Paper text:
As its name suggests, it is a fusion of two proteins, a jacalin-related lectin (JRL) and a [name] (DIR) at the N-terminus. Therefore, the development of disease resistant plants is mandatory. It was shown that the rice ([name]) protein OsJAC1 enhances resistance against different bacterial and fungal plant pathogens in rice, barley, and wheat. Here, we report crystal structures for both individual domains and the complex of galactobiose with the DIR domain, which revealed a new carbohydrate binding motif for DIR proteins.
Two of these sheets are canonical Greek key motifs, whereas in the third case the very N- and C-terminal segments of the protein join to form the outer and inner pair of strands, respectively. As indicated by PISA analysis, the extensive interface involving both hydrophobic and polar interactions buries more than 800 Å2 of solvent-accessible surface area on either protomer and is classified as stable in solution. In contrast to all other mJRLs from plants, the two chains of the non-crystallographic dimer of OsJAC1-JRL are linked via a symmetric disulfide bond formed by a cysteine residue close to the N-terminus (Cys161). Overall, the intimate interaction between subunits suggests a physiologically relevant mode of dimerization; accordingly, the disulfide bond may not just represent an artefact of crystallization under non-reducing conditions but may actually occur in the full-length protein (see Discussion section). The increased hemagglutination activity of the OsJAC1-JRL domain under oxidizing conditions points to a crucial role of the intermolecular disulfide bond that is consistently observed in both crystal forms.
Residue numbers in the entry:
A (entry chain B): 159 to 306
B (entry chain A): 160 to 306
Amino acid sequence: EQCPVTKIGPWGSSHEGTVQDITESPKRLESITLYHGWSVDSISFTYLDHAGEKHKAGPWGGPGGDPIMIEFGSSEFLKEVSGTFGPYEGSTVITSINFITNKQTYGPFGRQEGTPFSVPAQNNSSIVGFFGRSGKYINAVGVYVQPI
Amino acid sequence: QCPVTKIGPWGSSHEGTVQDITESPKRLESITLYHGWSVDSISFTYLDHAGEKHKAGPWGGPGGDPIMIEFGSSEFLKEVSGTFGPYEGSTVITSINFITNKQTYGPFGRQEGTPFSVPAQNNSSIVGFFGRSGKYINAVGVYVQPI
């Protein structure tokens, strides 16, 4: 109860984009809405915080792409985020992303081009939120991790 | 007693013998690395939550030149990064790099192949490692302790 969250990343552009983050420490990831096309245009997500209050973060990114909304049931948790990043329209962007839970694999979204990244959380720990930098695309993405 | 966070590994899909620690690390005290073309071996000493010292490793083989990194008072490991790629028939960690809050040690090895990185934010610290090894380190992951 009230174990501090771990913040890891980001991966992607070292210095491009507007900082994006959540204000209340996250405890449970409820949904992700991802817009994607050739690259990863935007991410939004809902999460429950340290006080049991739900928030929508985002969208972080631009208005392009087609949406997919992913809702996690109470027994589903995110155990790895992976993807690629590279040059797109003159910036380094997240070109593809994947979400691997204890139940399923969602993705790839985008195009698998450029440099890989991966953040596998072990020991049944969950990825419970995100942070990063964005413009018209996601330039860099990191994760919040909460053990059990 | 909040569990440590365990992230990774990066590198070889499945080659090598699983290597891990058995106590929850609180503070990383030293790293001993052997390196040449690739990262031959890693060992480290850490403090557990009762404050006693544990040695892990070495994990890896007999090659490379040694370096011993002793963390100073108030020095902690903020990011591990490196590369992995084919070497002598397997996928190995080809280079590694230790970014502390005071200085960077590395790169050790050859910066060739596929990059990996694990930055810890908000002054959290990388306090240990795990992975798979044989003659070299095949895959490596980290333990992270938030402040």
